[PDB]
Coordinates of all heavy atoms in Angstrom, one line a residue:
Chain A
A1147 N -7.0 -19.2 47.9 CA -8.1 -20.1 48.4 C -7.5 -21.3 49.0 O -8.0 -21.6 50.1 CB -8.7 -20.6 46.8
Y1148 N -6.6 -22.1 48.5 CA -5.9 -23.1 49.2 C -4.8 -22.6 50.1 O -4.4 -23.3 50.9 CB -5.1 -24.1 48.2 CG -6.2 -25.2 47.7 CD1 -6.5 -25.4 46.3 CD2 -6.8 -26.1 48.6 CE1 -7.5 -26.4 46.0 CE2 -7.7 -27.0 48.2 CZ -8.0 -27.2 46.9 OH -8.8 -28.1 46.4
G1149 N -4.4 -21.3 49.9 CA -3.4 -20.7 50.7 C -2.1 -21.4 50.7 O -1.5 -21.6 51.9
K1150 N -1.6 -21.7 49.6 CA -0.2 -22.4 49.4 C 0.1 -22.2 48.0 O -0.5 -21.8 47.1 CB -0.2 -23.8 49.8 CG -0.8 -24.7 48.8 CD -0.8 -26.2 49.3 CE 0.5 -26.6 49.7 NZ 1.6 -26.3 48.8
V1151 N 1.5 -22.7 47.7 CA 2.0 -22.5 46.4 C 1.5 -23.6 45.6 O 1.2 -24.8 46.1 CB 3.5 -22.6 46.4 CG1 4.2 -22.3 45.1 CG2 4.2 -21.6 47.4
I1152 N 1.4 -23.4 44.3 CA 0.9 -24.4 43.3 C 1.8 -24.5 42.1 O 2.1 -23.4 41.6 CB -0.5 -24.2 42.9 CG1 -1.5 -24.3 44.0 CG2 -1.0 -25.1 41.7 CD1 -3.0 -23.8 43.8
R1153 N 2.2 -25.7 41.7 CA 3.0 -25.9 40.5 C 2.6 -27.0 39.6 O 3.1 -27.2 38.6 CB 4.5 -26.2 41.0 CG 5.3 -25.0 41.1 CD 5.3 -24.3 42.5 NE 6.3 -23.5 42.8 CZ 7.5 -23.9 43.1 NH1 7.9 -25.2 43.1 NH2 8.5 -23.0 43.4
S1154 N 1.3 -27.6 40.1 CA 0.9 -28.7 39.3 C -0.6 -28.5 39.0 O -1.3 -28.0 39.8 CB 1.1 -30.1 40.0 OG -0.2 -30.4 40.9
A1155 N -1.0 -29.0 37.8 CA -2.3 -28.8 37.4 C -3.3 -29.7 38.2 O -4.5 -29.4 38.2 CB -2.5 -29.1 35.9
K1156 N -2.8 -30.7 39.0 CA -3.5 -31.5 39.9 C -4.4 -30.8 40.9 O -5.5 -31.1 41.2 CB -2.7 -32.6 40.6 CG -3.4 -33.2 41.6 CD -2.8 -34.4 42.0 CE -3.2 -34.9 43.4 NZ -4.6 -34.6 43.7
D1157 N -3.8 -29.7 41.3 CA -4.5 -28.9 42.3 C -5.7 -28.0 41.7 O -6.4 -27.4 42.5 CB -3.5 -28.0 43.1 CG -2.3 -28.7 43.4 OD1 -1.6 -29.1 42.5 OD2 -2.0 -28.9 44.6
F1158 N -5.8 -27.8 40.5 CA -6.8 -27.1 39.8 C -7.8 -27.8 39.2 O -8.3 -27.6 38.1 CB -6.0 -26.1 38.7 CG -5.3 -25.0 39.4 CD1 -4.1 -24.6 38.6 CD2 -5.5 -24.4 40.5 CE1 -3.4 -23.6 39.1 CE2 -4.8 -23.3 41.1 CZ -3.6 -23.0 40.4
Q1159 N -8.2 -29.0 39.8 CA -9.3 -29.8 39.4 C -10.6 -28.9 39.4 O -10.7 -28.0 40.3 CB -9.4 -31.0 40.1 CG -8.2 -32.1 39.9 CD -7.9 -32.8 41.2 OE1 -7.5 -32.2 42.2 NE2 -8.0 -34.0 41.0
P1160 N -11.7 -29.4 38.7 CA -12.9 -28.6 38.7 C -13.4 -28.3 40.2 O -14.1 -27.2 40.2 CB -13.9 -29.4 38.1 CG -13.2 -30.3 37.1 CD -11.9 -30.5 37.9
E1161 N -13.1 -28.9 41.3 CA -13.6 -28.5 42.6 C -12.8 -27.3 43.0 O -13.2 -26.6 43.9 CB -13.2 -29.8 43.5 CG -11.7 -29.9 43.9 CD -11.0 -31.1 43.2 OE1 -11.5 -31.5 42.1 OE2 -10.2 -31.6 43.9
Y1162 N -11.7 -26.9 42.3 CA -11.0 -25.7 42.8 C -11.8 -24.5 42.8 O -11.8 -23.7 43.6 CB -9.7 -25.6 41.9 CG -8.9 -24.4 42.3 CD1 -7.8 -24.5 43.1 CD2 -9.2 -23.1 41.8 CE1 -7.0 -23.3 43.4 CE2 -8.5 -22.0 42.0 CZ -7.4 -22.2 42.9 OH -6.7 -21.0 43.2
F1163 N -12.6 -24.4 41.6 CA -13.3 -23.1 41.4 C -14.4 -23.0 42.4 O -14.7 -21.8 43.0 CB -13.9 -23.0 39.9 CG -12.8 -23.1 38.9 CD1 -13.1 -23.6 37.6 CD2 -11.5 -22.6 39.2 CE1 -12.1 -23.6 36.7 CE2 -10.6 -22.6 38.2 CZ -10.9 -23.2 36.9
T1164 N -15.2 -24.1 42.7 CA -16.2 -24.0 43.8 C -15.6 -23.8 45.1 O -16.1 -23.0 45.9 CB -16.9 -25.2 43.7 OG1 -17.9 -25.3 44.9 CG2 -16.1 -26.5 43.8
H1165 N -14.5 -24.4 45.3 CA -13.7 -24.2 46.6 C -13.4 -22.7 46.8 O -13.7 -22.1 47.9 CB -12.4 -24.9 46.7 CG -11.8 -25.0 48.0 ND1 -10.3 -25.0 48.0 CD2 -12.3 -24.8 49.3 CE1 -10.0 -24.9 49.4 NE2 -11.1 -24.8 50.1
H1166 N -12.9 -22.0 45.8 CA -12.5 -20.6 45.9 C -13.8 -19.8 46.0 O -13.8 -18.9 46.8 CB -11.7 -20.2 44.7 CG -12.0 -18.7 44.3 ND1 -12.8 -18.4 43.2 CD2 -11.5 -17.6 44.8 CE1 -12.8 -17.1 43.1 NE2 -12.1 -16.6 44.2
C1167 N -14.9 -20.2 45.2 CA -16.1 -19.5 45.3 C -16.6 -19.4 46.8 O -17.1 -18.4 47.1 CB -17.1 -19.9 44.4 SG -18.5 -19.0 44.2
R1168 N -16.7 -20.6 47.4 CA -17.2 -20.7 48.8 C -16.3 -20.4 49.8 O -16.6 -19.5 50.7 CB -18.0 -22.1 48.9 CG -18.8 -22.2 50.3 CD -20.0 -21.3 50.2 NE -20.7 -21.2 51.4 CZ -20.2 -20.7 52.5 NH1 -19.0 -20.1 52.7 NH2 -21.0 -20.8 53.7
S1169 N -15.2 -21.1 49.8 CA -14.2 -21.1 50.9 C -13.7 -19.6 51.0 O -13.5 -19.0 50.1 CB -13.1 -22.0 50.8 OG -12.0 -21.8 51.8
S1170 N -13.2 -19.2 52.2 CA -12.9 -17.9 52.5 C -11.4 -17.7 51.9 O -10.6 -18.6 51.9 CB -13.0 -17.5 54.0 OG -12.0 -18.3 54.6
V1171 N -11.2 -16.4 51.5 CA -9.9 -16.1 51.1 C -9.0 -16.1 52.3 O -9.3 -16.0 53.4 CB -9.9 -14.7 50.5 CG1 -8.4 -14.2 50.2 CG2 -10.7 -14.6 49.2
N1172 N -7.7 -16.4 52.1 CA -6.7 -16.4 53.0 C -5.3 -15.9 52.4 O -4.7 -16.6 51.6 CB -6.5 -17.8 53.6 CG -5.6 -17.8 54.9 OD1 -4.4 -17.4 54.7 ND2 -5.9 -18.4 55.9
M1173 N -4.9 -14.7 52.8 CA -3.6 -14.1 52.2 C -2.6 -14.4 53.1 O -1.3 -15.0 52.6 CB -3.8 -12.6 52.1 CG -2.9 -12.1 51.0 SD -3.5 -12.6 49.4 CE -4.9 -11.7 49.2
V1174 N -2.6 -14.2 54.4 CA -1.5 -14.2 55.3 C -0.7 -15.7 55.3 O 0.5 -15.6 55.1 CB -1.9 -14.1 56.8 CG1 -0.7 -14.4 57.7 CG2 -2.3 -12.6 57.0
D1175 N -1.4 -16.7 55.2 CA -0.9 -18.1 55.0 C -0.3 -18.2 53.7 O 0.8 -18.7 53.5 CB -2.0 -19.1 55.3 CG -2.8 -18.9 56.7 OD1 -2.1 -18.3 57.6 OD2 -3.8 -19.3 56.7
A1176 N -0.9 -17.7 52.7 CA -0.4 -17.9 51.3 C 0.9 -17.1 51.1 O 1.9 -17.7 50.6 CB -1.5 -17.3 50.3
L1177 N 0.9 -15.9 51.5 CA 2.3 -15.1 51.4 C 3.3 -15.7 52.3 O 4.5 -15.6 52.0 CB 2.0 -13.6 51.7 CG 0.7 -13.0 51.1 CD1 0.7 -11.5 51.3 CD2 0.6 -13.3 49.6
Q1178 N 2.9 -16.2 53.5 CA 3.9 -16.8 54.4 C 4.5 -18.0 53.7 O 5.7 -18.2 53.8 CB 3.2 -17.2 55.7 CG 3.1 -16.0 56.7 CD 4.5 -15.4 57.0 OE1 5.6 -16.1 56.9 NE2 4.5 -14.3 57.5
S1179 N 3.6 -18.8 53.1 CA 4.2 -20.0 52.3 C 5.0 -19.5 51.2 O 6.2 -20.1 50.9 CB 3.0 -20.9 51.9 OG 3.4 -21.5 50.6
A1180 N 4.6 -18.5 50.5 CA 5.4 -17.9 49.4 C 6.8 -17.5 49.8 O 7.9 -18.1 49.3 CB 4.7 -16.8 48.8
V1181 N 6.9 -16.8 50.8 CA 8.2 -16.3 51.5 C 9.0 -17.7 52.0 O 10.3 -17.6 52.0 CB 8.1 -15.2 52.4 CG1 9.5 -14.8 52.8 CG2 7.3 -14.2 51.8
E1182 N 8.3 -18.7 52.5 CA 8.8 -19.7 53.1 C 9.7 -20.5 52.1 O 10.8 -20.9 52.3 CB 7.9 -20.6 53.7 CG 8.4 -21.9 54.4 CD 9.4 -21.7 55.4 OE1 9.7 -20.5 55.7 OE2 10.1 -22.6 55.9
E1183 N 9.1 -20.8 50.9 CA 9.8 -21.5 49.9 C 11.1 -20.6 49.5 O 12.1 -21.1 49.0 CB 9.0 -21.9 48.7 CG 9.8 -22.1 47.4 CD 8.9 -23.0 46.4 OE1 7.9 -23.4 46.8 OE2 9.5 -23.1 45.3
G1184 N 11.0 -19.3 49.4 CA 12.0 -18.4 48.8 C 11.4 -17.8 47.6 O 12.2 -17.0 46.9
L1185 N 10.2 -18.0 47.2 CA 9.6 -17.4 46.0 C 9.7 -15.9 45.9 O 9.8 -15.3 44.9 CB 8.2 -18.0 45.7 CG 7.4 -17.3 44.6 CD1 8.2 -17.5 43.2 CD2 6.1 -18.1 44.4
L1186 N 9.6 -15.3 47.1 CA 9.7 -13.9 47.4 C 10.7 -13.6 48.3 O 10.8 -14.3 49.3 CB 8.3 -13.2 47.8 CG 7.4 -12.7 46.7 CD1 7.0 -13.7 45.6 CD2 6.2 -12.1 47.3
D1187 N 11.4 -12.3 48.0 CA 12.5 -11.9 49.1 C 12.3 -10.4 49.0 O 11.3 -9.7 48.6 CB 13.8 -12.4 48.6 CG 13.9 -12.3 47.1 OD1 13.2 -11.5 46.5 OD2 14.9 -13.0 46.7
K1188 N 13.3 -9.7 49.6 CA 13.4 -8.2 49.7 C 13.7 -7.5 48.4 O 13.7 -6.4 48.3 CB 14.2 -7.9 50.9 CG 15.8 -7.6 50.4 CD 16.6 -7.2 51.6 CE 16.6 -8.1 52.7 NZ 17.6 -7.6 53.9
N1189 N 14.1 -8.3 47.5 CA 14.6 -7.7 46.2 C 13.5 -7.7 45.0 O 13.6 -6.9 44.1 CB 15.9 -8.5 45.7 CG 16.5 -7.8 44.5 OD1 16.8 -8.4 43.5 ND2 16.7 -6.5 44.7
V1190 N 12.6 -8.8 45.0 CA 11.7 -8.8 43.9 C 10.9 -7.5 43.8 O 10.5 -7.0 44.9 CB 10.7 -10.1 44.1 CG1 11.4 -11.3 43.7 CG2 10.1 -10.0 45.4
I1191 N 10.7 -7.1 42.7 CA 9.8 -5.9 42.5 C 8.3 -6.4 42.4 O 8.0 -7.4 41.9 CB 10.1 -5.2 41.1 CG1 11.6 -4.8 41.0 CG2 9.3 -4.0 40.8 CD1 12.2 -4.5 42.3
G1192 N 7.5 -5.5 43.1 CA 6.0 -5.7 43.2 C 5.2 -4.9 42.2 O 5.1 -3.6 42.5
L1193 N 4.8 -5.4 41.1 CA 3.8 -4.7 40.2 C 2.5 -5.2 40.3 O 2.2 -6.3 40.4 CB 4.4 -4.9 38.7 CG 3.9 -4.0 37.6 CD1 4.6 -4.3 36.3 CD2 2.4 -4.2 37.4
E1194 N 1.5 -4.2 40.4 CA 0.1 -4.4 40.7 C -0.6 -4.2 39.2 O -0.4 -3.2 38.5 CB -0.4 -3.5 41.6 CG -1.9 -3.7 42.0 CD -2.9 -3.0 40.9 OE1 -2.4 -2.2 40.2 OE2 -4.1 -3.2 41.0
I1195 N -1.6 -5.1 39.0 CA -2.4 -5.0 37.8 C -3.8 -4.9 38.2 O -4.4 -5.9 38.7 CB -2.2 -6.2 36.9 CG1 -0.6 -6.4 36.5 CG2 -3.1 -6.2 35.6 CD1 -0.4 -7.1 35.2
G1196 N -4.3 -3.8 38.2 CA -5.7 -3.5 38.6 C -6.1 -2.0 38.7 O -5.2 -1.2 38.4
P1197 N -7.2 -1.7 39.1 CA -7.7 -0.4 39.1 C -7.2 0.4 40.3 O -7.6 1.6 40.5 CB -9.3 -0.4 39.0 CG -9.6 -1.8 38.6 CD -8.5 -2.5 39.2
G1198 N -6.3 -0.1 41.0 CA -5.9 0.5 42.2 C -4.8 -0.2 42.9 O -4.6 -1.5 42.8
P1199 N -4.0 0.6 43.7 CA -3.0 -0.2 44.5 C -3.5 -0.9 45.7 O -3.6 -0.3 46.8 CB -1.9 0.9 44.8 CG -2.7 2.2 44.7 CD -4.0 1.9 44.1
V1200 N -4.0 -2.0 45.7 CA -4.8 -2.7 46.8 C -4.0 -3.9 47.3 O -3.6 -4.0 48.4 CB -6.1 -3.1 46.5 CG1 -7.0 -3.7 47.6 CG2 -6.9 -1.8 45.9
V1201 N -3.6 -4.8 46.4 CA -2.8 -6.0 46.8 C -1.4 -5.6 47.1 O -0.9 -6.4 48.0 CB -3.0 -7.1 45.6 CG1 -1.8 -8.2 45.9 CG2 -4.3 -7.7 45.6
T1202 N -0.9 -4.6 46.7 CA 0.5 -4.3 46.7 C 0.8 -3.9 48.3 O 1.8 -4.5 48.6 CB 0.9 -3.1 45.8 OG1 2.4 -2.9 45.9 CG2 0.2 -1.9 46.2
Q1203 N -0.1 -3.3 48.9 CA 0.3 -3.0 50.3 C 0.2 -4.3 51.2 O 1.0 -4.4 52.0 CB -0.8 -2.0 50.9 CG -2.2 -2.2 50.5 CD -2.6 -1.5 49.2 OE1 -2.1 -1.9 48.1 NE2 -3.5 -0.6 49.3
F1204 N -0.8 -5.2 50.8 CA -0.8 -6.5 51.5 C 0.4 -7.3 51.4 O 1.0 -7.7 52.3 CB -2.0 -7.3 51.0 CG -3.4 -6.5 50.9 CD1 -4.1 -6.8 49.8 CD2 -3.6 -5.4 51.8 CE1 -5.3 -6.1 49.6 CE2 -4.7 -4.7 51.6 CZ -5.6 -5.1 50.5
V1205 N 1.0 -7.4 50.2 CA 2.1 -8.2 49.8 C 3.3 -7.5 50.5 O 4.2 -8.2 51.1 CB 2.4 -8.3 48.4 CG1 2.5 -7.0 47.7 CG2 3.7 -9.2 48.3
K1206 N 3.4 -6.2 50.6 CA 4.4 -5.4 51.2 C 4.4 -5.7 52.7 O 5.5 -6.0 53.3 CB 4.3 -4.0 51.0 CG 5.5 -3.2 51.2 CD 5.3 -1.6 51.4 CE 4.5 -1.0 50.4 NZ 4.5 0.5 50.4
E1207 N 3.2 -5.5 53.5 CA 3.3 -5.8 54.8 C 3.7 -7.3 55.0 O 4.3 -7.7 56.1 CB 1.9 -5.6 55.5 CG 1.2 -4.3 55.0 CD -0.3 -4.5 54.9 OE1 -0.9 -4.8 56.0 OE2 -0.8 -4.2 53.8
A1208 N 3.3 -8.2 54.1 CA 3.7 -9.6 54.3 C 5.2 -9.7 54.3 O 5.8 -10.1 55.3 CB 3.1 -10.4 53.2
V1209 N 5.8 -9.4 53.2 CA 7.3 -9.6 53.1 C 8.1 -8.5 53.9 O 8.9 -8.9 54.8 CB 7.9 -9.6 51.7 CG1 7.4 -8.3 50.9 CG2 9.3 -9.8 51.6
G1210 N 7.6 -7.3 53.8 CA 8.3 -6.3 54.5 C 8.1 -4.9 53.8 O 7.8 -4.8 52.5
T1211 N 8.4 -3.8 54.5 CA 8.2 -2.5 53.9 C 9.3 -2.2 53.0 O 9.1 -1.4 51.9 CB 8.2 -1.5 55.0 OG1 7.7 -0.2 54.4 CG2 9.5 -1.3 55.6
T1212 N 10.6 -2.7 53.1 CA 11.7 -2.3 52.3 C 11.5 -2.7 50.8 O 12.1 -1.9 49.9 CB 13.0 -2.9 52.6 OG1 13.2 -4.2 52.1 CG2 13.0 -3.1 54.2
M1213 N 10.6 -3.6 50.5 CA 10.4 -4.1 49.0 C 9.8 -2.9 48.3 O 9.0 -2.1 48.7 CB 9.5 -5.2 49.1 CG 8.0 -4.9 49.1 SD 7.0 -6.3 48.4 CE 7.3 -6.0 46.5

Side-chain angles (χ1 to χ4, degrees):
Chain A
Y1148 275 117
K1150 79 180 305 310
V1151 183
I1152 294 171
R1153 271 83 161 290
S1154 92
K1156 160 160 164 40
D1157 318 66
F1158 288 149
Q1159 298 147 295
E1161 77 252 28
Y1162 179 96
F1163 300 154
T1164 172
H1165 184 214
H1166 148 258
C1167 186
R1168 188 64 186 69
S1169 171
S1170 69
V1171 175
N1172 185 309
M1173 211 65 77
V1174 167
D1175 310 332
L1177 317 187
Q1178 275 306 336
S1179 147
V1181 182
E1182 178 56 9
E1183 161 160 348
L1185 171 54
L1186 261 63
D1187 44 18
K1188 85 173 70 179
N1189 189 231
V1190 291
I1191 304 324
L1193 192 173
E1194 179 277 354
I1195 304 202
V1200 184
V1201 166
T1202 185
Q1203 45 270 69
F1204 318 143
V1205 57
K1206 200 203 301 197
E1207 322 145 56
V1209 55
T1211 190
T1212 88
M1213 81 156 287

